[PDB]
Amino acid sequence: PESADLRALAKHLYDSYIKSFPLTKAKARAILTGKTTDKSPFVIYDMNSLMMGKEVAIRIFQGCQFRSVEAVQEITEYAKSIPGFVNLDLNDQVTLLKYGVHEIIYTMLASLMNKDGVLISEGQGFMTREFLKSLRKPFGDFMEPKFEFAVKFNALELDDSDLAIFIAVIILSGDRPGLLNVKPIEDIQDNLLQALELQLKLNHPESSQLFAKLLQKMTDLRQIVTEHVQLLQVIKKTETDMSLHPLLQEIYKDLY
């Protein structure tokens, strides 16, 4: 009865994730392991390769920004399908997205990453980790912490069905600053956490302490974002104007 409703919730969340996110983890791992009738991705490992495929660091930084705009839009559409979300105070919907969208971007980016690099252009490109590491300060310091995160996170072996619920739980955090109505958010989160617990027991029966492991990952995600926003601050204080997308400006305004 109640277990049936938590599976229906699980499944609705997966359906919405499929509709909201055109590049899933299933498809990225097929590309990354080369088990696809598609041509292998174009590898970018320097200027030579980058060129075939402002200064180089900034052209890359600006590519990450443009892709982040689209990602925020897909994550918004996804958040809108989480039952109860559209009925929340609209100021609290805004706050949940502002403080949570980066945590989701880097959770999902991990689907596209291995120890050697990351898929770009909807899986048509692969940009190597050593290449990104070679970018000058502060740009060459952005992704290294995320590879450290991803390699460990990816060895938990979550699938799209697992991620859909993990993501939903993070978005409905009752502890973001400035929330007006904390309670209805915690009530949705609590039901989502129960759904996650059952999903992991059913989909990963033999994975030791997966639930507690994942809850620690949510905490690790906040640190990753704290540091990420420190670098953005430094860039804002000390670099030329990047002409930010107005959508990203609004989000960066409050966490700076």
Binding site: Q73, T76, L90, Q93, V94, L97, K98, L247, E250, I251
Partner: peptide, 12 residues
């Protein structure tokens, strides 16, 4: 303001 977040949130 957060005009752009609200615009995304209410488009159908």
């Amino acid at each position: 303001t957060s005009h752009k977040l609200v615009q995304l949130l209410t488009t159908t």
